[PDB]
């Protein structure tokens, strides 16, 4: 995924 959360 590109970012967390």
């Amino acid at each position: 995924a590109g970012x967390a959360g």
Partner: antibody
């Protein structure tokens, strides 16, 4: 592609700041957006992150007083901070930080001065 | 929560010198990928130079480059120029599928010896 900021200036201690960035040329829910601030002469401080999935996370120092939201209809993201003290005087920025992606976009920043 | 420590906190170097700034995270960054480097000149907004540890933004000169793995990272200015006077910040992304955090190093001021 722009991210013009609004809502800064002179604020009284004990009051609240409300800051908004209006995305010009794209949709605000496309990317996650951070709020960052820099007190005069000091370094950069991360306030919180609103992930493109919509969940807001805050640094521990800011969790008590801060709420970050977005209005997809408005094409804006918003920082709300209350119980302001002199230590909150800073240039405030909204930005997709681009720690890992080729896209990075920053507002021009607005100074918030907390003073009576 | 998370911390990031840059070293040194300030430095002076000559035009043409190779300059190295080390960043160091308190945890592993997201995917061991999400570290960027920013440059801030006086009275200007911060400007991103490097993203994903080593990718160079197309608007930035190729004398900037990054490297590092896991929790320790490096910015290299290969041939220092007068216009590189600035404060340089690393920024890191952190968290899980249920956590999202960003942290900045304290900044490294680069001064030009002349």
């Amino acid at each position: 592609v722009q991210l013009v900021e609004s809502g800064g200036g002179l604020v009284q201690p004990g009051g609240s700041l409300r800051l908004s960035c209006t995305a010009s040329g794209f949709s605000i829910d496309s990317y996650g957006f951070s709020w960052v601030r820099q007190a005069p002469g000091k370094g950069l401080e991360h306030i919180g992150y609103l992930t493109a999935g919509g969940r807001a996370f805050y640094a521990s120092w800011a969790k008590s007083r801060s709420t970050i939201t977005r209005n997809t209809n408005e094409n804006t993201v918003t920082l709300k901070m209350n119980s302001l003290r002199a230590e909150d005087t800073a240039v405030y920025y909204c930005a997709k930080l681009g720690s890992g992606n080729p896209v990075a976009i920053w507002g021009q920043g607005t100074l918030v001065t907390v003073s009576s | 929560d998370i911390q990031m420590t840059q070293s040194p906190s300030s430095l002076s170097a000559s035009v043409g010198d190779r300059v190295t700034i080390t960043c160091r995270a308190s945890q592993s960054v997201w995917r061991n990928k999400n570290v960027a480097w920013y440059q801030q000149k006086p009275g200007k907004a911060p400007k991103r130079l490097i993203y994903a540890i080593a990718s160079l933004y197309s608007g930035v000169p190729s004398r900037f480059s990054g490297s590092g793995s896991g929790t320790d990272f490096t910015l290299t200015i290969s041939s220092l120029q007068p216009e590189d006077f600035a404060t340089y910040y690393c920024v890191g992304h952190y968290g899980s599928e249920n956590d999202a955090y960003y942290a900045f190093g304290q900044g490294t001021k680069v001064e030009i010896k002349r």
